[PDB]
Amino acid sequence: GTFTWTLSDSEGKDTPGGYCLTRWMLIEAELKCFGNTAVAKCNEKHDEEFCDMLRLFDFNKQAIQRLKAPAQMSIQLINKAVNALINDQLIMKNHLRDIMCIPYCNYSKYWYLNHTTTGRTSLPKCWLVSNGSYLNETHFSDDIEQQADNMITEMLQKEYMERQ
Amino acid sequence: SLYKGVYELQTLELNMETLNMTMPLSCTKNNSHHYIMVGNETGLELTLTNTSIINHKFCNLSDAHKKNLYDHALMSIISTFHLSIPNYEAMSCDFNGGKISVQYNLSHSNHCGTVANGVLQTFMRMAWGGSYGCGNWDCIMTSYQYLIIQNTTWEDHCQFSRPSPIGYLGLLSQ
Amino acid sequence: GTFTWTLSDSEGKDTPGGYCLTRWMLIEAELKCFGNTAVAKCNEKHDEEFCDMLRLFDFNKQAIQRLKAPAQMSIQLINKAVNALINDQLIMKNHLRDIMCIPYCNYSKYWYLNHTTTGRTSLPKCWLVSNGSYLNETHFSDDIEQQADNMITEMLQKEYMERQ
Amino acid sequence: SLYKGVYELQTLELNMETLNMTMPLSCTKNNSHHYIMVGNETGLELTLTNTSIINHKFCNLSDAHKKNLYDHALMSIISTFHLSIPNYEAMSCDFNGGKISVQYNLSHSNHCGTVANGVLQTFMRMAWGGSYGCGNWDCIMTSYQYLIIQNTTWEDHCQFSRPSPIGYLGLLSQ
Amino acid sequence: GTFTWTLSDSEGKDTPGGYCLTRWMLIEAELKCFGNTAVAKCNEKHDEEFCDMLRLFDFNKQAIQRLKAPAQMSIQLINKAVNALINDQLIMKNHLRDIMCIPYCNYSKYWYLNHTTTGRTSLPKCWLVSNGSYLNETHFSDDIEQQADNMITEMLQKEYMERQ
Amino acid sequence: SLYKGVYELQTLELNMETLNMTMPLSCTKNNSHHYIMVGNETGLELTLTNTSIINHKFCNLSDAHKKNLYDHALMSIISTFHLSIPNYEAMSCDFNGGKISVQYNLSHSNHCGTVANGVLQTFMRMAWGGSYGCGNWDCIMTSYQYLIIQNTTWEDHCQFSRPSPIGYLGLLSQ
Ligand SMILES: *[C@@H]1O[C@H](CO)[C@@H](O[C@@H]2O[C@H](CO)[C@@H](O[C@@H]3O[C@H](CO[C@H]4O[C@H](CO)[C@@H](O)[C@H](O)[C@@H]4O)[C@@H](O)[C@H](O[C@H]4O[C@H](CO)[C@@H](O)[C@H](O)[C@@H]4O)[C@@H]3O)[C@H](O)[C@H]2NC(C)=O)[C@H](O)[C@H]1NC(C)=O
Ligand SMILES: *[C@@H]1O[C@H](CO)[C@@H](O[C@@H]2O[C@H](CO)[C@@H](O[C@@H]3O[C@H](CO[C@H]4O[C@H](CO)[C@@H](O)[C@H](O)[C@@H]4O)[C@@H](O)[C@H](O[C@H]4O[C@H](CO)[C@@H](O)[C@H](O)[C@@H]4O)[C@@H]3O)[C@H](O)[C@H]2NC(C)=O)[C@H](O)[C@H]1NC(C)=O
Ligand SMILES: *[C@@H]1O[C@H](CO)[C@@H](O[C@@H]2O[C@H](CO)[C@@H](O[C@@H]3O[C@H](CO[C@H]4O[C@H](CO)[C@@H](O)[C@H](O)[C@@H]4O)[C@@H](O)[C@H](O[C@H]4O[C@H](CO)[C@@H](O)[C@H](O)[C@@H]4O)[C@@H]3O)[C@H](O)[C@H]2NC(C)=O)[C@H](O)[C@H]1NC(C)=O
Ligand SMILES: *[C@@H]1O[C@H](CO)[C@@H](O[C@@H]2O[C@H](CO)[C@@H](O[C@@H]3O[C@H](CO)[C@@H](O)[C@H](O)[C@@H]3O)[C@H](O)[C@H]2NC(C)=O)[C@H](O)[C@H]1NC(C)=O
Ligand SMILES: *[C@@H]1O[C@H](CO)[C@@H](O[C@@H]2O[C@H](CO)[C@@H](O[C@@H]3O[C@H](CO)[C@@H](O)[C@H](O)[C@@H]3O)[C@H](O)[C@H]2NC(C)=O)[C@H](O)[C@H]1NC(C)=O
Ligand SMILES: *[C@@H]1O[C@H](CO)[C@@H](O[C@@H]2O[C@H](CO)[C@@H](O[C@@H]3O[C@H](CO)[C@@H](O)[C@H](O)[C@@H]3O)[C@H](O)[C@H]2NC(C)=O)[C@H](O)[C@H]1NC(C)=O
Ligand SMILES: *[C@@H]1O[C@H](CO)[C@@H](O[C@@H]2O[C@H](CO)[C@@H](O)[C@H](O)[C@H]2NC(C)=O)[C@H](O)[C@H]1NC(C)=O
Ligand SMILES: *[C@@H]1O[C@H](CO)[C@@H](O[C@@H]2O[C@H](CO)[C@@H](O)[C@H](O)[C@H]2NC(C)=O)[C@H](O)[C@H]1NC(C)=O
Ligand SMILES: *[C@@H]1O[C@H](CO)[C@@H](O[C@@H]2O[C@H](CO)[C@@H](O)[C@H](O)[C@H]2NC(C)=O)[C@H](O)[C@H]1NC(C)=O
Ligand SMILES: *[C@@H]1O[C@H](CO)[C@@H](O[C@@H]2O[C@H](CO)[C@@H](O)[C@H](O)[C@H]2NC(C)=O)[C@H](O)[C@H]1NC(C)=O
Ligand SMILES: *[C@@H]1O[C@H](CO)[C@@H](O[C@@H]2O[C@H](CO)[C@@H](O)[C@H](O)[C@H]2NC(C)=O)[C@H](O)[C@H]1NC(C)=O
Ligand SMILES: *[C@@H]1O[C@H](CO)[C@@H](O[C@@H]2O[C@H](CO)[C@@H](O)[C@H](O)[C@H]2NC(C)=O)[C@H](O)[C@H]1NC(C)=O
Ligand SMILES: *[C@@H]1O[C@H](CO)[C@@H](O[C@@H]2O[C@H](CO)[C@@H](O)[C@H](O)[C@H]2NC(C)=O)[C@H](O)[C@H]1NC(C)=O
Ligand SMILES: *[C@@H]1O[C@H](CO)[C@@H](O[C@@H]2O[C@H](CO)[C@@H](O)[C@H](O)[C@H]2NC(C)=O)[C@H](O)[C@H]1NC(C)=O
Ligand SMILES: *[C@@H]1O[C@H](CO)[C@@H](O[C@@H]2O[C@H](CO)[C@@H](O)[C@H](O)[C@H]2NC(C)=O)[C@H](O)[C@H]1NC(C)=O
Numbered sequence A, C, E: 001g002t003f004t005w006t007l008s009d010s011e012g013k014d015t016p017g018g019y020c021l022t023r024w025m026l027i028e029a030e031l032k033c034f035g036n037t038a039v040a041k042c043n044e045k046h047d048e049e050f051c052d053m054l055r056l057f058d059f060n061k062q063a064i065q066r067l068k069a070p071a072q073m074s075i076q077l078i079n080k081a082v083n084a085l086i087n088d089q090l091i092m093k094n095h096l097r098d099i100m101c102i103p104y105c106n107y108s109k110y111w112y113l114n115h116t117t118t119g120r121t122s123l124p125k126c127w128l129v130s131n132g133s134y135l136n137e138t139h140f141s142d143d144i145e146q147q148a149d150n151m152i153t154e155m156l157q158k159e160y161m162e163r164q
Numbered sequence B, D, F: 001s002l003y004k005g006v007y008e009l010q011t012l013e014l015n016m017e018t019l020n021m022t023m024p025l026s027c028t029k030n031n032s033h034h035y036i037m038v039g040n041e042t043g044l045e046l047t048l049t050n051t052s053i054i055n056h057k058f059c060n061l062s063d064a065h066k067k068n069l070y071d072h073a074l075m076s077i078i079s080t081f082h083l084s085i086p087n088y089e090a091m092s093c094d095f096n097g098g099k100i101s102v103q104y105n106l107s108h109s110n111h112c113g114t115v116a117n118g119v120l121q122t123f124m125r126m127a128w129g130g131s132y133g134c135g136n137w138d139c140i141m142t143s144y145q146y147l148i149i150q151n152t153t154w155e156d157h158c159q160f161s162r163p164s165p166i167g168y169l170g171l172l173s174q
């Protein structure tokens, strides 16, 4: 019950921890699961494209399972629900970046770091595009490394405080 | 590729098609065709042409619901597009039978400020695709004279893009 | 002056610390005060029903004390102020949960943990309802315990860093 | 009840009645009656009936402010309710004298898409109470033919609920 | 690349770290630069007037440099972009405070602490006004000191964890 | 001044004039004059007077764009102000030639609820300045009979204030 970003309050207790995306939810991929700590970051972050997409999937799951009603789109339901589920500022910033020919997120692919042998995952970040294609890791090599360092720092700080 | 010795860079790609049951998805084929899809059965094509389908100089939109309408979802989507456009009545509409369609007259005299642009801008906003000469978007124009909105069937319409709820949702946010 | 969630900047300096709710503000209860640390969490949290209610009371107090004007409702004032004071997303999520028959907050009662002999309080969370009644602590026992552990962790981390 | 040995679970309940001086509070009595209250003196009842109060086929709403209106707060609340409803003129209004009242005709031919539902949905939204068969809320209907909005006095109207600012505020947010 | 509050993703790599405001951006002042750590706070803070102003300047810079188009105001661009760049709640709270004759931020001057010999800076906070003039540091002496203590605490906590 | 021994209190002041190329700035001179400026060339004065400029009892606003309009930016700003005001047609407009101007008739019979107040309130909101008797802002009135909006040139208009984008942006947020 460490996830507040979700609509219902059940989701966390079912999977042992973390949050899983099944095969059907992914393109050309098998089941992937992210650590509880990283997923829980969406509870407070109010600036991440991944978290909003994650929330839409959670919503969709609930709508399908909860509404016994014929599965017609309830347009009224979406029009009502979107204000609660989506951060419109992210939508507009990516729209704005596209307008100004600045690399931006088009909500496709997400890139994350995975610490070898431990399977420790960062929360995924959006893989930016410009001029009809994706940007190379070379352009944003620096950001990739910043995330690696952020993960290292958390690991060490935890060890020190656990040791205390 | 290991960063700082131990962190592998790994990728994830989302399948947004699974969201088709609750929200419309926008997917494009090329600069002339954008497609909005509902569920696994229907949708509307948005297309740019130099020909017409409607010979009317008027839009019978309110009559489309006065008559029992053909699909609340589609009428809602069409209305949303129209409501977004700032107005001016440069629109003709048919809505006769199950085949529902609307046509906009993208006419102008300098084009800056016309509703024809309001239509073009909304059209592009509805389906970003990859949006590919970095000028201002504010007063733009295209070569096509007309915009057609028409019902269609569940086939193809996904090239240079994949279905995404973002277009529709973005307009709701506006 | 550790509270930024308030409208005026005076509120904290008056009571020794923390924030108090008088008898008149509570149902069938006497004065209750919460610790400064917990109250201050509302400065950054943007997802808590309790904090928005707390803010409305603070607003109300200021409107009554500040406006010398006949106490008519200024509808225009509320219509103007609400956008700043209330997180509409919380309102809509609880509305949505009700629609989908998912337990939700109806802004009534709030449940908190109190560490014995020290009086250390968590910030209160909303007590959910469904099908005309309140949910038992059994259904959300897990969340209650998560909060207890969160409080324990903070206590220990503080002791260790204070010791350093 | 001590969690982890030392944490007592303790409860708090808010008195929202103290907010009556600055914002309207919504409180219900049953499925036929919802009450909106102002200050410590007045308010409006919202009720579902199968009888009528207004014999008009028209609403003299603008005339209600043309004439010096009877209370800006109440006119504002009434207007807000009406503005929320998507439109269609299935409303009749009196507003003659201090007793102000409005009546909606909840008429329909399949009911999905009617303004009668827009009214029913807004009505319920305005006063959640405890909202108690998990179907879609989008196209719903009730047994009552009419909705009456009328001034009233400061008595009772709180059963299965307590006064709360949430209903009103939620509509402002929309 | 530690700044996410910006529109483009380049801004951080250019200046060695931190964020600089040139002479042209300041009134009666020469170049000033703030530390990276403090600036980065705007990535998560959703309640600070300084951060929104900072963002407008960043936007302006990009619009001028990126748009090759004649520099006419694109009103449509601003009307579109503002929703993403400005926290309207701050605008409304200051508006509300002014209405109620409560000291408020009018987005003019900002006050910060600077640790001597190290040049360590807090993120600036808005200097409030009321009744046609600025408030004295005496009225908000307490807040100034709270910030000084917050900086001290961070310094010490870092030293202890670095030592671990 | 060192706090806790080591922290100097230092100040920063922002120059918002550098933002003139992308967004309008509001700057005042006194209670009778508020000025909105664009780029480094033009702007609109907002002024409170007891005289008139327009002898019309009507506003030719739509004709202002029907005719090739004189500046999209200014027409947009004027429209925005007008749209903000809740309505009532107590407005006359000229827009003839490059000199564009509008005049509002701030007429009332008790003033509470008139559009004249809607205009006064928006006017003040547009340019806070320093806003300097703590009564409610809701139903206020001034001594001036008319509001004039008129094009002007790039001179002065900054006393007791400095240019700021906040006024305009605040109205967009509303
Ligand atoms: C975010 O931004 C990125 C970057 O622009 C977009 O990425 C593009 O995604 C599209 C769709 O996945 C790629 O387009 C093409 O997809 C074809 C698959 O569909 C075909 O077959 C079905 C039937 O099964 C038909 O219905 C359909 O009409 C098509 O005929 C591929 O076959 C295409 O292959 C061609 O290009 C590749 C190069 O990538 C060559 O190797 C092939 O030989 C062939 O010539 C093609 O892949 C498009 O390529 C992607 N671009 C890039 C740079 O990767 C994202 O779509 C966008 N948004 C989201 C939400 O993801
Ligand atoms: C959030 O959701 C919860 C759960 O549904 C709601 O909780 C309900 O709250 C109401 C109001 O407090 C409870 O309703 C009844 O209140 C009566 C008190 O008012 C009476 O007297 C006044 C005069 O003083 C009259 O004006 C008024 O009309 C009433 O006649 C009690 O007397 C009722 O008692 C009956 O039920 C209890 C069981 O609880 C029996 O023991 C009694 O003998 C008697 O039969 C009753 O309490 C309602 O019971 C609460 N429900 C639950 C499950 O607790 C919240 O109101 C809602 N929102 C907010 C903001 O709180
Ligand atoms: C936030 O709130 C604060 C507090 O109210 C406002 O601060 C005021 O700012 C204004 C403008 O900076 C100060 O007003 C006066 O500015 C004059 C400068 O402009 C003159 O010269 C130009 C040509 O160069 C002309 O175009 C223009 O019309 C003016 O003639 C000064 O000359 C004035 O000086 C007078 O007052 C001072 C006292 O401060 C005396 O010492 C002088 O001798 C003289 O009598 C004056 O400074 C105003 O004083 C400031 N008030 C306070 C309390 O500091 C902010 O503007 C507001 N918003 C923002 C965004 O900053
Ligand atoms: C629209 O989205 C739905 C998902 O929301 C897509 O349908 C899903 O298709 C997969 C693969 O066929 C089904 O997976 C398997 O289904 C069986 C039977 O239910 C189950 O026993 C397996 O364990 C597994 O889950 C999935 O259930 C099904 N979901 C639903 C709700 O039907 C649908 O194909 C999408 N439509 C379009 C046009 O893309
Ligand atoms: C609407 O809300 C107001 C509160 O905002 C309620 O009035 C309050 O009632 C309490 C109890 O009677 C008063 O408490 C005591 O008042 C005396 C005299 O002021 C004071 O000396 C005591 O120390 C104590 O505060 C409280 O002051 C009063 N507040 C106000 C502003 O009048 C009112 O009853 C509510 N109305 C309804 C219909 O519920
Ligand atoms: C409206 O804002 C622009 C800034 O966005 C103001 O123009 C700026 O004026 C300064 C001082 O004259 C220029 O600084 C210097 O310019 C030269 C030549 O470009 C350069 O070599 C120096 O290193 C330095 O940057 C600045 O470039 C110029 N910026 C632009 C975009 O023109 C303008 O004065 C403001 N208008 C009003 C009415 O206040
Ligand atoms: C991070 O790397 C580990 C190690 O490969 C991944 O764990 C494996 O995931 C695959 C997924 O198909 C399983 O088949 C393996 O059994 C897992 N264990 C190992 C040690 O291989 C982990 O999934 C990666 N993280 C993510 C989110 O993909
Ligand atoms: C987008 O694709 C469509 C479909 O292939 C192209 O339109 C077709 O053009 C041929 C040749 O003129 C006609 O026979 C088909 O009937 C047309 N199909 C449709 C659906 O109109 C269209 O020209 C392409 N546009 C761009 C910009 O590439
Ligand atoms: C869109 O849907 C309509 C029906 O909802 C289709 O119209 C049918 O068209 C066929 C072929 O001409 C007729 O035999 C049917 O009688 C029509 N039905 C009705 C009630 O309109 C239309 O063809 C579809 N359009 C596309 C492009 O798929
Ligand atoms: C639609 O028709 C118009 C009018 O013929 C086309 O616009 C002209 O195209 C010729 C080339 O064939 C150019 O030399 C002219 O300069 C164009 N006119 C203008 C005002 O630019 C237009 O290209 C046609 N559109 C499509 C999609 O075929
Ligand atoms: C947590 O528990 C302590 C201990 O009971 C509470 O402190 C008491 O509160 C009551 C309230 O009526 C006072 O009468 C007592 O004098 C307080 N002291 C003790 C030791 O009993 C504290 O209030 C509780 N926390 C909350 C928020 O209720
Ligand atoms: C809600 O309560 C009201 C008030 O008790 C009920 O309406 C009353 O019904 C009696 C008997 O027909 C009449 O004599 C009263 O005049 C009615 N009062 C009012 C205010 O209309 C109403 O039926 C109840 N509704 C539900 C769903 O329980
Ligand atoms: C609502 O308020 C109005 C007055 O604002 C009340 O109307 C009065 O009703 C009594 C009884 O019939 C008359 O004697 C008065 O002359 C009326 N005054 C005016 C000016 O209308 C009305 O009764 C109230 N309604 C309720 C249900 O309380
Ligand atoms: C209002 O009047 C209508 C019409 O008489 C009532 O609706 C019918 O009620 C009978 C039972 O008396 C049912 O058998 C019918 O099937 C109902 N009609 C429909 C279309 O469902 C309605 O119940 C009355 N409403 C109230 C609140 O008394
Ligand atoms: C905090 O204080 C230090 C020490 O004065 C400032 O660093 C100096 O800034 C001035 C700015 O003109 C430079 O000329 C000096 O060379 C800098 N070094 C020293 C040691 O004087 C620092 O800028 C201050 N912080 C801020 C944000 O103003």
Ligand SMILES: *[C@@H]1O[C@H](CO)[C@@H](O[C@@H]2O[C@H](CO)[C@@H](O)[C@H](O)[C@H]2NC(C)=O)[C@H](O)[C@H]1NC(C)=O
Pocket (backbone or CB within 6 Å): F029, F030, F031, F032, F033
């Ligand atoms: C605000 O300043 C203006 C400009 O000085 C004042 O209006 C001037 O008044 C003189 C004397 O009547 C006239 O000759 C000028 O033509 C007026 N100028 C303008 C632009 O109207 C105005 O009275 C001042 N208002 C306040 C409240 O101080």
Ligand SMILES: *[C@@H]1O[C@H](CO)[C@@H](O[C@@H]2O[C@H](CO)[C@@H](O)[C@H](O)[C@H]2NC(C)=O)[C@H](O)[C@H]1NC(C)=O
Pocket (backbone or CB within 6 Å): F097, F098, F099, F100, F151, F152, F153
């Ligand atoms: C505002 O701008 C207009 C032009 O855009 C100015 O109008 C001109 O005024 C002069 C002096 O009377 C005439 O010679 C020009 O022919 C006018 N041009 C047009 C096309 O209107 C007007 O004076 C400006 N107003 C202010 C106060 O600066």
Ligand SMILES: *[C@@H]1O[C@H](CO)[C@@H](O[C@@H]2O[C@H](CO)[C@@H](O)[C@H](O)[C@H]2NC(C)=O)[C@H](O)[C@H]1NC(C)=O
Pocket (backbone or CB within 6 Å): F049, F050, F143, F144, F145
């Ligand atoms: C505009 O004209 C009106 C009408 O003459 C002025 O209002 C009156 O001013 C006299 C003083 O000259 C007061 O004794 C009256 O009480 C005022 N009337 C009202 C209804 O209050 C008004 O002051 C003039 N406005 C300006 C800016 O000069």
